Point group: C8
Chain length 101, copies 8
């Protein structure tokens, strides 16, 4: 009863954290999408202006793609690590309930 209430509060508190992680993951993708499209807009403007040397933009383009690639890998590593860690806490939570209940 009282144990059922605490385990209840712990389970629903665990879900808010899980949903809180899903929020941050989406928020990052939106941020990266905006920044990446701002960078492409900058590089595109140069190509229109022709201000940047053909080699200059090639180096600029490859840096944009490289950092974007790097940004995704980091976000992939973070969310992957978070989801897996929460899952173990989901198992501990379940282990507590069955054993007690």
């Amino acid at each position: 009863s009282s144990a059922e209430e605490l385990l209840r509060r712990s389970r629903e508190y665990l879900k808010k954290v899980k949903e809180e992680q899903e929020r941050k993951a989406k928020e990052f993708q939106e941020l990266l999408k905006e920044l990446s499209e701002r960078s492409e807009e900058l590089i595109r403007e140069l190509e229109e202006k022709g201000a940047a040397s053909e080699a200059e933009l090639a180096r600029m383009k490859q840096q944009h793609m490289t950092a974007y690639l790097e940004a995704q890998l980091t976000a992939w590593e973070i969310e992957s690590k978070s989801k897996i860690a929460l899952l173990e806490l989901q198992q501990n939570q379940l282990n507590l309930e069955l054993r007690h209940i």
Copy 2:
């Protein structure tokens, strides 16, 4: 009773740790906001002066956005790790409460 004291004390201390980490998270967003808002202001100044080449300001702006993104990812990594460890510590606490 005496065990009720210690376990209640631990719960409240965990509560303080959780709040201090929420502070540091918010404080960082405020710091990153200010500094980032300065960096955008500097690049604005350079644009209006035309004190940097068109390509150079493309490089500076993209470096600015790259560092902001790196910073957000790092703070996201720290807070995500903190919240989940405390979550495990809170489970140990809960298990003890149940144990008693």
Copy 3:
């Protein structure tokens, strides 16, 4: 009740594992696309003589070096992810036999 929770626990486990396969596949598609763009940019340069022979060598090697770094990183992620869930799959299996 114990079976329902554990069955529901295995389903969420399955979704997480499946999702991790989703991201790994998506990355390889992203890597190939960006990789094929990068070699296209390098293609155009050499054809136009835009970059010096020394310049294109450093550019090509930067591209291969970045591609190798990307794979090793994605390898480390997917490798660690799969093994971490693998311990959770064993934790799940241990819970089931417990009942």
Copy 4:
């Protein structure tokens, strides 16, 4: 009795380690503040003397903020990892206290 003595001693040595880390955290903040204020001083002297181009100073100023943001994150990472790790040891200490004595 000796269990109580050994465990009370444990409680104190662990209270000292915790205070030691609060001390190190403050010292770094004072350290970063002093050095970070030299940087602004060196830079203000440049802007005053006009000894760096408008872009050089902007690159220097954003370099300073970028390094400052990294120092805070890195210090935040250490103190956070330390506080959480010590927290778990206090839990073990608390578990022994309920058991051993």
Copy 5:
């Protein structure tokens, strides 16, 4: 009986994960070999055409070996971490087998 089925299945899924990592390890070596041989090709063309100074080529050649050494260490780090981690899971699987069935 069902324990034996669940555990034998576990044994097989874990044998598949192990073979999968031996596969990934080889693929990388083939991958590194192909790209690493392009680098030597691009560089041999430079030395032939004399399109880089004596020092530039030396800096490029030592750059190539330095990156190659990093790729091996990094791949060695991953495969080693993977093999050891899987090894422990095989031990848990072996522990269950002695117990559950």
Copy 6:
């Protein structure tokens, strides 16, 4: 016999903890020395006008930036080291009470 092993186990534990304090102190002495050398080199430059005002600013900031990085690194090491042994000290204390 159990007491001898555990007493001997605590002595080796003590040596390791003491040794870790030795390295932490030694590093701060190394850092200060190298740091004081570096600021001496920078001192000589500005006095001789060897480096431009812009040059010395970047040099000074590189030195402070490297010093900060060194401290954070040594902080992370000594902090992690002490906590890791602290769990081993608790493991030792748990073994003793077990007897």
Copy 7:
């Protein structure tokens, strides 16, 4: 008996893992030796030609020694981590053998 088979099989497999890691350690020292011996040869060639400034070869030599030192530290970190993990795994194995 049947348990004696499995635990003996695990001991021999652990034995193979320990040996494969000794291989990789030695193989790396051989690779680092060759490449490092090439790098020293290149800098020798440059010295005899006088194809690089005196200061430049000081920078190149010091970069060469820095990378060799970084490489050794990394391989030292990998093997030190591997040997100690297997050592823990070998202890789990031993505990099982004792358990039976």
Copy 8:
């Protein structure tokens, strides 16, 4: 008896690893000492030749001290991590003996 023999073999095997770590630590310090003194010999030669600009050597010197500082920190981190990990295996070894024994 037979257990006393296996635990014996495990304890002495643990000591060879511990001594093996002490070897690598010393070996590194010797290597760093030699390389560091080779670098100082190079920088010293330049100052005698005066080949390097007074600012050039100042940058060169600071890089030598910085990398040396970095090298020590890495070695400090490795040996510290190794010694602590071996110690836990020393505790597990002792725990196995007393319990069996």
